C-alpha cells in the first residue's frame, strides 16, 4: 500500500481507539439500499408540471429550482402528497451501516432524511437530533445529528430541507444545528463517506473552513468511491484545501457499476487494521515498545504481574522473570526485542536515536528483573534489594534528610513520606498539600495523583487515630491529647468534605488515563486482589501435600509466594506509598510468611532423601536472611509468633 | 527429567511418569507397561490380611492378568516426556528400597 | 454515604451533616398517629416505601435494635434447581418484558445458549424506552456474558474434547458462530454505562460495577479477618455478606453466577469459615476443658450451605475440606429439604440418561454438581425411599464416562455409613450385580481407576448380611457351562453369594494343581480353607527353595502361619533364607538387628492388631519410638498411637 494511505489508516485507527471519531454520512450509503433518489422526484415534478421530461437539461441549479417552482405554483399539499407517495416505502439496512457502527463512532452526522442509519442503530443508543427543539432536550452525550430534517414528525415538506428557498435561508432557520455541527467538526476527527467531490455540502464546509486559521483545525479525511481513478491535479488541489483523500478505486479493481464492494474494501481494511499493529522492521518494534513503556520511567520499580495490563493482555509476565506469549497475533515484538538484546551484531541495524532508545529499554528491563523468554530461560538467579530508608528503619538519616534543604519536587515527596512514617502527620499533610499546590506545571502528573492518594490515606489515619485516642479513655498519656488541635481537625474536615476517591482517576486527563493505566488500582483494594486469590489457592495445595506425606524433589511452589511477596514490598516501599500502613497488607504479609515457614519446617526433616536420592540432588534450603527478620518483626503480633512457635 | 519425581512416604513409593520394558521371567517379553498402586486400609477382606496397597499392572493401556509374578529382569526405562533413558536411576532407586514395587505411575489414596 | 446499612438490618449515621431524614422515617414507621399527619399522596408513597424496606430487610436503627435474628430466603427457581418447573415456565406465553428477561435467564441456565442469546437480542430490540432502561442495560450485559461463555465453550470443545468426550460434538452450528463473531466484532463493555442517558446514570449508579471485569475484590480481601489467631463476630458478618451477594445475583437473574471468579470466591469463603470454626473449637478445648464446651462446633450447617457446597465445590476441594476441617463433628440442619433436593437431583439424572436427550452444554455444568452432592450426602440422614431412589439413580443411570465402577462403589460405601443397609438397598445391589453378570456374557472387561471391582459389592453385602443368597445369580450359574471362561471367573469373584448346590456345580470348572494355582486361587477366588494337601504343596515349594538355596512369595506363607491359617511344625525347618519369614515364624529367637521398620507400612488393621497382641511388642515399640524421634513421620506416629498404645 501507499505510505499516505497507511498513515491515514493509522491516524483513523488511533482516533477511533481514543473515542474521538465522528462519521459524516452522505447519500451514496443510502443509495446502496436502493432508496429513491432525488433526481427521480425531480423527474416526477417535471412530468407533473410541464408534461414531458428532458434528460439532457438537468443542471445543479435546476435540481433546486424545479421543486421550488412546483411548490410555488401547485401549492403545498401536492408537495406533501408526492413526498408521501415516493418516500413512504421501507427498505432493509445495508452492510455498510453495520460496518460504520462497528468502528465505534462518537458522533454520526448525516445529511440523509431517512431512517436506515437510525434503524440499523444492533444495540447502540444515540440521541437523534433532527429539529431545533431537540437540541436542548438531548438525553445522552452522543448525537446522531440529521442536519437536513428527518421525516420523524411527518411527511410534510416543512420538516426537511429540499428546495432552493430552504437552502438559501438555512443559516437563519437552523442556527443551533449549524453551530453544533461546526463545533463537532472543529473538535473531533471527521471522516466523510458517500459524498461526491463536487457536492454542495462539501463545498459549503470547505468555504467555512477557509476562514479559520492555519493551525487550529485538523484536516478531515475523505473516502472517495468513484469508478474513475483520481487525477493528480485534482487530488493536489483538494489536499491544499484541507481534505486528506483516501481513494477506493486505487485499493481494489472493479467494474464501473460496482459500488457495494468498492465501499466494502476500504471499510473492511479500516476494521481489520484496528487490531493490526503496523510493525515490520526492528525500528518499529523499538519505537512501539518505547512508546508503551516510557511513561513508567518516573516510577522507580514496577511489579512484573502488572505488566500484563500495560501490554493489553498480549503477554504473560511471570514472577520468575520469564515472558510467555498469551494472545499475540502480531510479529512477536518482545521476542524480536530479546533477540536484539542477545546479539550485538543486529544492534548496528538501528538508527542512533533508536539505538539510544533500545539502550534505555534494556536498562529498564534489566532493573525490573525481566530476563528473557520462557523456553530460553535457564538457571535464572534472582536477588532481593530494597533501597528505601523507611524500610530499614534508619530514623536518624530520615530526620537529617528532612532537615536538609530540598531542591526538587521528588525530594519533597520523599520528605513527606518520611514525615508520615515518623508520625508527624500534621506536617506531612501540610507538605502534601504544598506538593499538590506546586504541581500545576508538570510533564507527567504521576506525582500529583500519588500525592492526592497519600493525603487521603493520611486523612483516614488521622481520623481513626482521633477515634481510638478519645475512645480508649486517656489511659495512655496524661490526657491522651494528640497534636490534633481542633482547629486543625476542623480545617481537615472542611477541606475533605466532598473529596471522592472513586472519581479521582476518572477526572484525570486522557493522556494520564491512557499511559498510567496500572496506577488505577492504587485507590482501592483491587491491587491486593490478584495476589491474595493466588495465595489462598497455593495454601490449599501446599497443605494438601503435608497431609499425604509427599516430598517433592524439584522446585517447590513457595518460590511463587516469596517472589510475589518481595515484588509487592519493593513496589510499595520504593515509590513511597502510605498503603504500607494498612491492616490488609500486614495480614497478607503475615499469611505469606507463616506459609513459607511452615513449608520450610516440614521440608527440613525428610525421610528417604539422604538414604538414596541425596547422591543425585539436594536443594532443600530455606535461609532466614535480614529481610525475613525485618518482615517478621514488622508485620507480626506476639500471638501470631507464639502460634508459629507452637506449630 | 527428575523435576517431576515425587516420593510418597505413606506407602514408601516413588511417583515417576516412566514406561517399563520389563521382561517377564522365563523368556516372556513385555513392551512399555507400567504400574498403579492404590492405598486402602479399610477394605473388607478374608484371609488375605497381609495387604494395604493393591498393585495393578497396565500394559498397552489394558490390565494384565497375573498368573505368576516373578519378573526380575528390570526394564529399559523410557521417560515418555521426550524419550529419555533413565534405567540406571531406576535400578539404583530400586536397590535403595526394600519395597516390592519401588516406582509407579499414579497413586490413589482411598483413605 | 449519609448512612451505614449494616448486614444485620440496622442503620447508623456516618456522614450526614444535615437533617436526619431516615430517623424521622423510622419514627413515622413505628407510630400511627404521627403517620397520619401526611397527605394522601405522601401516605401512599410512605406505604410503598415501607413495603420496599420490609421486603429488603431493613429493620430499625442501631439504638432501637431488638431481637435481631436473621434468616436468608432466596425466591428463585434457578437456585433450587427445579428444572422441570422452569422448563414448563419457558413454554408459557409471556405477558410483559420482565417475563421475557426471566425466560432468557432460565434458558441460559438450562444450557440453551443460542435461544437465550436470541431472546436477549429481541428484548434489546423491543425495550429502548423510556424508564425501563435497567432492563436494556442488564440485557446488554447478559448478552455479552453469554457470548463470552460460548466462545470459551468453543475453545475447550474443539480441543481437549471430541472423542475424548465421546464425539466431535459441535455444540453450535458454524453459521451461528459466524453470526456471533460478526455481531460482536468490536463490542466494548467498558463504555456501556457512559453511553446511557444522564438520568439513568444519575439514578442507577449502583449498577456500574456490573460492567467491570472484576467486582468481588472487596470481599476476597476482607476474607483475611478469618485467619486472625488473636484471642457481631467476623464469622456472622462474612456469612451474611455472602448470602447477600448470592441473593442479589440470583434474584435479579444475572449470568455472572456461572463464572470462575464467583465459584472461587464461594470456595474461599466457605473453606475459611469452616477452618476458623474448627480452630476456635480446638482452642476452647485446649484452654477451657476437655468437654466443657461440649465438643460441638458452632458452625451449624443449613440447607443453603449444603446447596452452595454442592454447586460451587469440586471433588478435590471437598476432600481437602474433609481432611483439614473434620466434618463428622459438624451437625447438619434441615434434613427434609436436603433429602428433597437430593431426590430431585437423582430424578433429573434419571431423566437425562433415560430420555437420551443429552444436552452437551448442560451436561458439563450439571454433572459436577450431581457428583459433588452425592459425595457430600454422606453426613445427611436419609429416609428409606429417598435412599432407594438415590441408590437406583447412582448405580444404574449415572453415566459411565464420569463414574467408573470403583468410584461408584466408593460413593455407595460413603452413603451407607450413617444409614446402614435395609432390605431394599440390598435388593437393588443384587439387581445391579445380576445385570453386570448378564453383561459379562465377548471382548468385554471392567475398567476401574481406584482398583475396585464387582467383588467389593458382594463383600459389602456379606458384611451387612451374613446370610444372603442371590437366587438369580444361582440360576445364572446353574445354566453355566465350561465354554464361557470369563463368566466363571466373574462368578468366582462372587463365590460366597451363590447357593451351596450352585457352589458345588461351579467348583467343577476350576481346580488347583501347583503352587501357582494355589496362590492365584486364594488371591482372586476364595479357598479360605487350608486343606492338608494344599499345605503339602506349599511344603514342596519350600523344600525346593531350601535345596536350591526375586519377588515375594515366602513372606506370604510366613504371615499365613503367624495368623494361624496354617498349623504345622515343618515351617521351623525353613529358617534362614528370608528374614521376614523368620520374624513371622520364630519371634522369640529372631535377631531384631535385621528388622526394618518399613515392613510395618504394608500390614492392615487386623495383622497390626495381632502383632500388637503378641509378646515382639516391646522391640517394635522401641523401633517405632526411634523412628518417630529421628524423622517426624505421620504414618509411624499414627500406627504407634492407634495400635501399640
Numbering used by the authors:
A (entry chain B): 22 to 142, 145 to 670
B (entry chain E): 10 to 120
C (entry chain A): 336 to 566, 578 to 787, 789 to 896, 909 to 974, 976 to 1005
Paper's wording?
The defense-associated sirtuin 2 (DSR2) effector, a SIR2 domain-containing protein, protects bacteria from phage infection by depleting NAD+, while an anti-DSR2 protein (DSR anti-defense 1, DSAD1) is employed by some phages to evade this host defense. The NADase activity of DSR2 is unleashed by recognizing the phage tail tube protein (TTP). DSR2 is arranged as a dimer of dimers, which is facilitated by the tetramerization of SIR2 domains. DSR2 has a two-domain architecture, with the CTD responsible for sensing the infection signal and SIR2 acting to prevent phage propagation.
We therefore reconstituted the DSR2-DSAD1 binary complex and determined the cryo-EM structures at resolutions of 3.4–3.6 Å. DSAD1 is trapped by the tip of the CTD fishhook. Particularly, sheet-2 of DSAD1 packs above the H3 subdomain. The H4 subdomain, along with the H3 subdomain from the adjacent molecule, brackets the β-hairpin of DSAD1. Notably, Tyr16 of DSAD1 stacks against Tyr574 and Phe576 from the adjacent H3 subdomain. The interaction between DSR2 and DSAD1 was significantly compromised when mutating Tyr574 and Phe576 to glycine, indicating that the formation of DSR2 dimer appears to be important for DSAD1 binding. While the overall structure of the DSR2 molecule in the absence of DSAD1 is similar to that of the DSAD1-bound DSR2 molecule, subtle structural discrepancies are discerned within the H4 subdomain. The H4 subdomain moves outward by ~10 Å to accommodate DSAD1. The H4 subdomain seems to be critical for DSAD1 binding, as supported by the fact that the H4 subdomain and DSAD1 constitute the largest interface between DSR2 and DSAD1. Furthermore, DSAD1 was compromised in binding to DSR2 protein upon the removal of the H4 subdomain.
